[PDB]
Structure formats: C-alpha cells, structure tokens
Amino acid sequence: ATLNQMHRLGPPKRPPRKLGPTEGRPQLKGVVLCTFTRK
Amino acid sequence: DPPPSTLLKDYQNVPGIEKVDDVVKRLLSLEMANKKEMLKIKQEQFMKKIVANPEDTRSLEARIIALSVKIRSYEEHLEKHRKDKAHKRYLLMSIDQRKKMLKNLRNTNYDVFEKICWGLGIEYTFPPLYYRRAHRRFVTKKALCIRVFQETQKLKKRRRALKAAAAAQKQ
C-alpha cells in the first residue's frame, strides 16, 4: 500500500485472541455426568 | 440561435461578400451548413461578449465558453434523443469539467469569473460535503425531526407569554 493508505488505515488491528475450552483459564472444576469411549 | 442568414465564420470577413448574388449568400450562410457551423458562430459571439482578448483560445475563459457551447449542443441533442446513453454521459462529464474550470477560474481571477457567469448565465454552486443515499428511512426520519423541532419552537414561545403575563399580574 502507499504511505497515504498505510497512514489512513493505521496500524494493523490484531484480532483479539480466542479463548479455548477453558475460557482462558489453566484448569476448571467439573462434575462427571457419564463415562464412555470414543473411536 | 444566430439567424440562418448569418454568414459562416470563414466567409464573414472576405472583401465583397455583401455585394454577391443572393444565391451565393444562401450558400455561404448557416442555413446551408451543418449545426457545427452554427456552434462556431455562437462560440464567437460569447468570446467577444465576455473575454478581454477574443483571439486567445487557450485561456481558461475561452475554454469555459468553448465547453459551454458543447454542453448546450448535448442538451439539445438529448432533448430529441432521450435514450442516447453515450451523449448523456458526455453531457454529465462536460458539466463536471466546466465546474472544475469555473472552480479554478474563481480561485485565480474572480473578476473574470464573475463576467463568465453573467455572460454564460451560469449559477455557480458549491458542492455538497457528503454524498450519501437518502433512502426511505432517512428521508422520513429527517422530515419528522424537522417537524419535531418546529413544534418545540412554538411551545417555547407559548412558555414566554404565560410567564410574561403572570409576571405583570404581580405588579
């Protein structure tokens, strides 16, 4: 892009990092509902 | 438009053109020529009427006059050819290029800019700041917001008299 275009866009807006199954936490407490096996 | 009897721009200054047979005058007049020959006469009239030097064709004044004659020709063409999209484009582009000339003439020579507008009958208009679709929801809300403003103004004046009247009674 041109300098005018880079100035007009500004710095690249980095998308906020997604949160995995733990929702950004190291561990979670849980209560077992059922047990089974997966292929 | 110039009269049909008007001589062509090329034959108007030849010596002895006023003493030739009437038939020769018809053959050298606008009546026997295409419309482009009538437009050259219109351009010449506007030049002498407006520009200080009618022989300078490269000045910003002459170009506005030359382009203004083309614009009137397109408007007359489109009056008879309303589905001619090619010439409708040429008209809109030519109007946009004359505004760009008038803008640059206004910025450099205002006294000449005024004579060009009077001479050609052009009403210079400043562009709108924002070009955005006035859709139904916008055109309805803007109308309501103007009505609401008008009503609030009336109520505020009826709150000036009642307060004024009560104040007088105390005296």
Partner: protein
C-alpha cells in the same frame, strides 16, 4: 489451472438455490414477519424523538408512513 475451486462454489450455489426452492414458502412467511418488526422498530425510533424533545404526541398532522411494504 484446474477448476476445483470453481467446482466447490458451483456445488455450494447449486445446493443453496435448491434449498431456497424447497423452503421458499417458509422463507416468505419469515420475511413478512421481519418486515413487520422492522416497521415497528422504525416507528419506535421516531416516537423516541418527539418524546425526548418534550412533546406528548406526534407533531400535528404527522402520520408515520409504511416504508417497507411492497405497495
């Protein structure tokens, strides 16, 4: 080049057109309901204006038009 990317889009578009054809009567009932809610949301937007300006009713002679109907 191969047309493998076009082919993916070809099938996506084919299946979408067929889905719309299979459900065109349900989609028409949904569209009607959305336009009704859209009209109500518009009327509320205008009513908020005159109410926040101190008026108790709409400006004299004002009738909110139906700007989303086919008519």
């Amino acid at each position: 080049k191969n047309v493998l990317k076009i082919r993916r889009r070809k099938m996506n578009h084919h299946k979408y057109r067929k889905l719309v054809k299979k459900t065109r009567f349900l989609r028409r009932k949904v569209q009607e309901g959305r336009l009704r809610r859209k009209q109500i949301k518009f009327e509320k937007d205008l009513r908020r204006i005159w109410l926040k300006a101190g008026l108790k009713e709409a400006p004299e002679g004002w009738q909110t038009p139906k700007i989303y109907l086919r008519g």
